[PDB]
């Protein structure tokens, strides 16, 4: 099982675990984030992951075709998943653009963020050592805000288009385009290095963080719950959708990946192994992130909740501070950002390939026989690059935050998971699904999967959605910038672009099918083959 290991190990460490989980945990007060995180994990995450893999293997086709075999009425789930992937690919690559910019900035004798004597730095800067010797600002934070981002006062001020970051996105997109068109992927002896290097780097960062003088307070903030105050809907949605985002579920890529295997594989063992390990690596890297934050709190003399930004830049603020505290910081900075680029590039390759397949399968005659696939791939990459340019401007950070919060996370993932589990448990039939699983892997799902799909996942998703609507709180960048109403409307438009697919497809297929309305629904609910 050792190479299976290396394959699916490349599989479960991604920008999600390293980057998204730490800042989401930090944003929700730390310890309080973990309780809904594990509740959603064991309630829905693993069962929905297993369910999606089972669909992918059962149909032996793409994520859009399977619903035709299962439930023709709810075929809109595949379109929702493919549009979720399409929106995710646009903004997920900006992280690699920032990583590329940091890596290019790392080719210096002294790291630019280790001290503040440069041009872009504000007069209020004080060295972290000297800050406790307040209106002062840490050099790393203002480097992230002013040199890389050049952050605008708000989303209403796009500002100039940062040319260096635009070229970084262009370089990353060229790498992706060449890899997808030429089929370049980690298949030779390089797979072992690609699978082991991220874990080695994370272990080094964890060791450095835990040995910091202020690590203990960071761990206390990371693990101590705050159920008395922090039980807002926001933490529940954030943890539940972080579970669904770390796994490639509700995106429709897991069905395609599962279709690559066969019934002889040890399904429901690989699923639990990969899911538990994927959550475990996130939980482990949380210790490193929060220990670095605790060291920052000890050094700067301020609370842990105030040391760094409550946003996507937590990874780009904490880790550079960690590599600053190691011998020869340039070497560790270069290694860390090479690791980050590889870790994000592999996932981006997988997502773009899945999108390309799920779109060419809708018209193979035109997109695979009437025209070369290279042209279609170039079209997809170019359109995504022009769309991603919107997050490169000086105010691009706000757009990226909105995209992360709405386009490929939040209520849309709960919507997709609820409709998946509802359809399979109730419309298609839990007994039928268990019988199919018996036919494929040899044993029934058991009470845990079945009761999860029937009750627990629908209850959790509906409860989170209703609790969010009842106790609604608007999105805010960091914890001080309030988005305008039009930006919130745009975010909800991004979410609804995925949510509305199911009702639209239901109504369209109802209209396009002949017969009485009762007969229309009854026939469109019948499985195929």
């Amino acid at each position, epitope marked *: 099982k050792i190479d299976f290991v290396l394959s699916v190990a490349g599989g479960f460490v991604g920008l999600g675990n390293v980057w998204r989980f730490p800042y989401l945990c930090y944003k929700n007060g730390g310890g309080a984030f973990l309780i809904p995180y594990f509740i959603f994990l064991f309630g829905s995450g693993l069962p929905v992951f297993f369910l999606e893999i089972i669909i992918g293997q059962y149909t032996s086709e793409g994520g859009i075709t399977c619903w035709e075999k299962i439930c023709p009425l709810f075929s809109g789930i595949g379109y929702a998943s493919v549009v979720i992937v399409s929106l995710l690919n646009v903004y997920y690559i900006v992280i690699l653009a920032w990583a590329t910019y940091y890596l290019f900035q790392s080719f210096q004798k002294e790291l630019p963020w280790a001290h503040c004597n440069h041009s872009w730095n504000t007069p209020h800067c004080m060295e972290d050592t000297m800050r406790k010797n307040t209106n002062f600002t840490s050099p790393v934070i203002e480097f992230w805000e002013r040199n890389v981002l050049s952050l605008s006062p708000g989303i209403d001020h796009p500002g100039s288009l940062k040319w260096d970051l635009a070229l970084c996105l262009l370089l990353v997109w060229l790498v992706c385009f060449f890899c997808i068109w030429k089929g370049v992927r980690s298949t030779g002896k390089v797979v072992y290095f690609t699978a082991t290097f991220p874990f080695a780097m994370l272990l080094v960062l964890l060791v450095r963080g835990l040995t910091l003088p202020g690590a203990g307070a960071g761990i206390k903030f990371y693990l101590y719950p705050d159920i008395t105050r922090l039980e807002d809907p926001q933490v529940w949605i954030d943890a539940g959708t972080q579970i669904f985002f770390s796994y490639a579920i509700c995106l429709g890529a897991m069905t395609s990946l599962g279709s690559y295997n066969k019934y*002889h594989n040890n399904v429901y063992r690989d699923c639990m192994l990969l899911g538990c390990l994927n959550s475990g690596t996130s939980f482990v890297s949380g210790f490193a992130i929060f220990s670095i934050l605790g060291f920052m709190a000890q050094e700067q003399g301020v609370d842990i909740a105030d040391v760094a930004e409550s946003g996507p830049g937590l990874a780009f603020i904490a880790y550079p501070k960690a590599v600053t505290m190691m011998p020869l910081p340039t070497f560790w900075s270069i290694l860390f950002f090479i690791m980050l680029l590889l870790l994000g590039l592999d996932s981006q390759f997988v997502e773009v390939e899945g999108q390309i397949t799920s779109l060419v399968d809708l018209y193979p005659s035109f997109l695979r026989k009437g025209y070369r696939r290279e042209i279609f791939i170039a079209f997809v990459c170019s359109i995504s690059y022009l769309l991603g340019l919107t997050m490169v401007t000086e105010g691009g950070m706000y757009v990226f935050q909105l995209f992360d919060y709405y386009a490929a996370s939040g209520v849309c993932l709960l919507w997709v998971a609820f409709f998946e589990c509802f359809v399979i448990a109730w419309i298609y039939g839990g*007994n*039928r699904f*268990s*019988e199919d699983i*018996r*036919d494929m892997i*040899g*044993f*029934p799902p058991g009470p845990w999967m079945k009761y999860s799909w029937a009750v627990i996942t629908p209850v959790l998703c509906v409860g989170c959605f209703i609790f969010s609507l009842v106790k609604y709180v608007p999105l805010t960048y960091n914890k001080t910038y309030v988005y305008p109403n039009w930006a919130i409307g745009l975010g909800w438009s991004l979410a609804l672009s995925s949510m509305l697919c199911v009702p639209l497809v239901i109504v369209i297929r109802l209209c396009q099918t002949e017969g009485p309305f009762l007969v229309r629904v009854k026939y469109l609910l019948t499985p195929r083959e």
Partner: antibody
Framework: EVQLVESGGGLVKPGGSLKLSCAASGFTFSSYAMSWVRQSPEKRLEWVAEISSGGRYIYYSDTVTGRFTISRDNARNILHLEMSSLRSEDTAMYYC????????????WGQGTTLTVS | ENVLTQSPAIMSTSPGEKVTMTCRASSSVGSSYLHWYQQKSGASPKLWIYSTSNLASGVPARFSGSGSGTSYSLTISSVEAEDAATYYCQQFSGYPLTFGSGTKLEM
């Protein structure tokens, strides 16, 4: 998980037809797959047919695929095997076995019924 | 059809001594899809070992089994008069299902 009983065995002529029944008790018959296993007078065991829990998936041995039909009554909790053309080699002792988990084997075996051709 | 076979078709045995049996398959069976059944004379077969190592409910702890690929075996720590029965290996990996030739312990 207690009791399984076969019935319907008897003497028939070659090329005839016979229906075999297998009653189930002590467990939810609709939640477990059922399989028929055959023991020749030489005591050699041979698998015959399998029916899934809901009856949607059916498998047959290569030697009985064209002549044997397996069916179940989930409401009645009774398992039935139908033979349309009994050859000379079909004379044997028939068992109905519970095979819900392929990785665990046939948990329980019935008493069995003999079949003879003359 | 994956034909199975068992070597010691007839095995004369005496109480107390350790005994062993072997099962072989024409095709590579998964370790989780092979099972052993005991059948006393005049009685229906009973499940004995499943997943090549897991003893069934009624089998005493003296029994054991191991194997992989296309070669498998079953062993007895110390036989007894109550162990005089016929044992069949069976593969559950692919259809048609097949049973081994069977080994009957003479005592």
């Amino acid at each position: 998980e207690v009791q399984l009983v076969e019935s319907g065995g008897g003497l028939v002529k070659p090329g005839g037809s016979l229906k075999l029944s297998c009653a189930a008790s002590g467990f939810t018959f609709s939640s477990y797959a059922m399989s028929w296993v055959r023991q020749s007078p030489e005591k050699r065991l041979e698998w015959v047919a399998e029916i899934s829990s809901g009856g949607r998936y059916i498998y047959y041995s290569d030697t009985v695929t064209g002549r044997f039909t397996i069916s179940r009554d989930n409401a009645r909790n009774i398992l039935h095997l139908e033979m349309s053309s009994l050859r000379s080699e079909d004379t044997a002792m028939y068992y109905c076995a519970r095979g819900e988990v392929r990785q665990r084997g046939f948990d329980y075996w019935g008493q069995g019924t003999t079949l003879t051709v003359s | 059809e994956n034909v199975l076979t068992q070597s010691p078709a007839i095995m004369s045995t005496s109480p107390g001594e350790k005994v062993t049996m072997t099962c072989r398959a024409s095709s590579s069976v998964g370790s989780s899809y092979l099972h052993w059944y005991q059948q006393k004379s005049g009685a229906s077969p009973k499940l004995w070992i499943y997943s090549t190592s897991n003893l069934a409910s009624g089998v005493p702890a003296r029994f054991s089994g191991s194997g992989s690929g296309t070669s498998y075996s079953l062993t007895i720590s110390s036989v007894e008069a109550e162990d005089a029965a016929t044992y069949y290996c069976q593969q559950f990996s692919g259809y048609p299902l097949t049973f081994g030739s069977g080994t009957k312990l003479e005592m």
